[PDB]
Amino acid sequence: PQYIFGDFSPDEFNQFFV
Amino acid sequence: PQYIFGDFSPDEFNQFFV
Amino acid sequence: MVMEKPSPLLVGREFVRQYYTLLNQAPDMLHRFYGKNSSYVHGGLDSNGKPADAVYGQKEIHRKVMSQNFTNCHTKIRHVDAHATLNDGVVVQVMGLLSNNNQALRRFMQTFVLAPEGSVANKFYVHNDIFRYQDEVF
Amino acid sequence: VMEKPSPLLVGREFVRQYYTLLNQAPDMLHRFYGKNSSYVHGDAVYGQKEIHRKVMSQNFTNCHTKIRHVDAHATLNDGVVVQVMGLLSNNNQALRRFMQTFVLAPEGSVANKFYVHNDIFRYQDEVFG
Domains and CATH numbers, chain D: 7-126 (3.10.450.50)
Taking CB atoms and an 8 Å limit, are C130 and D99 in contact across chains? no
Hey, is the C-beta of C39 within 8 angstroms of any chain D C-beta?
yes
Q: Which of D5, D16, D115 sits opposite A6 (nearest CB)?
A: D115
Cβ contacts of D29 within 8 Å, gap of 6 or more:
D18, D21, D22, D51, D52, D55
Q: Which of C14, C29, C34 sits opposite B3 (nearest CB)?
A: C14
d(CA D30, CA D55): 8
- Determine the Cα angle at C90 with ends D86 and C52, to 5°: 40
The one-letter amino acid code at C127 reads: H
Q: Chains touching chain D at 3 or more Cβ pairs under 8 angstroms?
A: A, C
Going by the DSSP 8-state scheme, the letter that residue C129 receives in this structure is E
Q: Which of A3, A8, A16 sits opposite D13 (nearest CB)?
A: A3
Per the CB < 8 A criterion, the answer to whether C12 and C20 are in contact is no
3-class state of residue A6 by DSSP? coil
d(CA B6, CA C119): 12
How far separated are the first and last CA of chain D, in Å rounded?
46
d(CA D109, CA D52): 24
The one-letter amino acid code at C99 reads: S
In angstroms, what separates the C-alpha of B7 from chain C's closest C-alpha? 5
Residues 78-117 on D with a CB inside 8 Å of C are 79, 81, 83, 85, 97, 99, 101, 103, 105, 117
> Residue B9: exposed, middle, or buried by beta-carbon count in 10 A (0-12, 13-18, 19+)?
exposed
Hey, is the C-beta of C14 within 8 angstroms of any chain B C-beta?
yes
| DSSP labels, C8-21 | HHHHHHHHHHHHHH
Hey, is the C-beta of D44 within 8 angstroms of any chain C C-beta?
yes
User: Taking CA atoms, what residue in B is nearest to C6?
Assistant: B3
d(CA D98, CA D67): 9
CA torsion sign for D110, C118, C116, D30 is positive
Nearest to D114 by CA among D78, D83, D82: D78
User: How many CB contacts within 8 angstroms connect chain B with chain C?
Assistant: 41
Which experiment gave this structure?
Answer: X-ray
Identify all chain D residues contacting A1, using CB atoms and an 8 Å cutoff. 13, 17
User: Taking CA atoms, what residue in D is nearest to A6?
Assistant: D32
In angstroms, what separates the C-alpha of D110 from chain C's closest C-alpha? 18
| Secondary structure of chain D as H, E, C letters | CCCCCCHHHHHHHHHHHHHHHHHHCHHHHHHHEEEEEEEECCCCEECHHHHHHHHHHCCCCCCEEEEEEEEEEECHHHCEEEEEEEEEECCCCCCEEEEEEEEEEECCCCCCEEEEEEEEEEECCCCCC
Q: How many helices (H) and strands (E) would you count in chain C?
A: 2, 6
d(CA C123, CA D9): 32
Per the CB < 8 A criterion, the answer to whether C87 and D77 are in contact is yes
Q: Which of C11, C26, C126 sits opposite B3 (nearest CB)?
A: C11
Identify all chain C residues contacting D124, using CB atoms and an 8 Å cutoff. 95, 107, 109, 134
d(CA A3, CA C53): 24
